Write a protein that holds these residues in place. Structure first.
Motif, PDB file in Angstrom:
ATOM      1  N   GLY A   1      -7.220   6.406  -2.983  1.00 42.87           N
ATOM      2  CA  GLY A   1      -6.377   5.231  -3.096  1.00 42.87           C
ATOM      3  C   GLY A   1      -4.922   5.432  -2.799  1.00 42.87           C
ATOM      4  O   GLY A   1      -4.248   4.518  -2.293  1.00 42.87           O
ATOM      5  N   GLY A   2      -4.407   6.603  -3.154  1.00 47.81           N
ATOM      6  CA  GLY A   2      -2.980   6.845  -3.087  1.00 47.81           C
ATOM      7  C   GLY A   2      -2.514   7.529  -1.823  1.00 47.81           C
ATOM      8  O   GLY A   2      -1.313   7.748  -1.615  1.00 47.81           O
ATOM      9  N   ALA A   3      -3.443   7.837  -0.933  1.00 47.16           N
ATOM     10  CA  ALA A   3      -3.077   8.573   0.289  1.00 47.16           C
ATOM     11  C   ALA A   3      -2.015   7.826   1.101  1.00 47.16           C
ATOM     12  O   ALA A   3      -1.082   8.427   1.647  1.00 47.16           O
ATOM     13  CB  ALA A   3      -4.305   8.797   1.124  1.00 47.16           C
ATOM     14  N   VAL A   4      -2.126   6.506   1.144  1.00 51.14           N
ATOM     15  CA  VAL A   4      -1.210   5.706   1.935  1.00 51.14           C
ATOM     16  C   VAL A   4       0.205   5.698   1.384  1.00 51.14           C
ATOM     17  O   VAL A   4       1.090   5.196   2.046  1.00 51.14           O
ATOM     18  CB  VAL A   4      -1.671   4.225   2.105  1.00 51.14           C
ATOM     19  CG1 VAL A   4      -2.964   4.142   2.953  1.00 51.14           C
ATOM     20  CG2 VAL A   4      -1.763   3.522   0.775  1.00 51.14           C
ATOM     21  N   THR A   5       0.419   6.235   0.185  1.00 52.35           N
ATOM     22  CA  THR A   5       1.783   6.338  -0.338  1.00 52.35           C
ATOM     23  C   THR A   5       2.571   7.402   0.399  1.00 52.35           C
ATOM     24  O   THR A   5       3.800   7.436   0.319  1.00 52.35           O
ATOM     25  CB  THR A   5       1.859   6.620  -1.870  1.00 52.35           C
ATOM     26  OG1 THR A   5       1.353   7.928  -2.180  1.00 52.35           O
ATOM     27  CG2 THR A   5       1.116   5.588  -2.613  1.00 52.35           C
TER      28      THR A   5
END
Ligand SMILES: Nc1ncnc2c1ncn2[C@@H]1O[C@H](COP(=O)(O)OP(=O)(O)O)[C@@H](O)[C@H]1O
Ligand SMILES: [Cl-]
Length: 179
Positions: free
Chosen positions: A79-83
């Motif tokens: 979920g947080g990869a795009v941060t």
């Protein structure tokens, strides 16, 4: 390069759609959280606790970049990869399917809400709303296809993606003629 990279909030269907899409396409399925544990021999929780979120994001970015280069099937992103700006850069040019979901549906699909310990404090649903607020704009930025999963069942989601991922065969004509 992957046939599709799936992004979205918890409960949006990354696992479920990953599996069903990979089955429908007859391709391999890789999930980046699983790949991190497989490549490091450390749990996601242990990396965060020991190294901190920034080093987690470093390792994640390296794993995502490897998979984008080396995997030809379906890839689901944590979920947080795009941060990570570097992950957003790496994704550019890929087929990126954003599985959209509402906060209430995402909460439901991830086990429901929790007790609210203090009237003045949050519950799970409120924490989820915050996650959505921070993440959804990033998924919208990186997407090349957006699919609403709130009122489509998994099969309908997969049919919708398939209808927008078609690959004509350059050898089509010759196959009819002989092969
Ligand atoms: N499109 C959908 N409609 C209804 N239920 C769904 C849909 N996609 C996923 N689910 C259900 O929601 C739950 C979470 O799905 P999952 O694929 O694990 O999400 P993620 O991997 O994005 O966290 C599972 O019980 C799954 O069966
Ligand atoms: Cl449709």
């Amino acid at each position: 390069a992957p046939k599709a990279v799936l992004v979205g909030l918890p409960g949006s269907g990354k696992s479920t759609i990953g599996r069903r899409l990979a089955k429908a396409l007859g391709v391999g399925l890789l999930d980046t959280d699983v790949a991190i544990e497989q490549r490091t021999g450390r749990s996601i929780a242990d990396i965060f606790a020991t190294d901190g979120e920034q080093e987690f994001r470093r390792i994640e970015e390296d794993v995502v970049r490897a998979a984008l280069a080396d995997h030809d099937g379906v890839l689901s992103l944590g979920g947080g990869a795009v941060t990570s700006p570097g992950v957003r850069a790496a994704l550019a040019g890929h087929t990126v399917v954003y599985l959209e979901i509402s906060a209430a549906e995402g909460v439901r699909r991830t086990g429901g809400n929790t007790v609210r310990p203090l009237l003045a404090g949050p519950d799970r649903a409120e924490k989820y709303r915050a996650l959505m607020a921070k993440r959804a704009p990033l998924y919208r930025r990186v997407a090349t296809m957006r699919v609403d999963t709130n009122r489509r069942n998994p099969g309908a989601v997969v049919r919708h993606i398939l209808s927008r991922l078609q690959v004509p065969s350059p050898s089509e004509a010759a196959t009819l003629e002989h092969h």
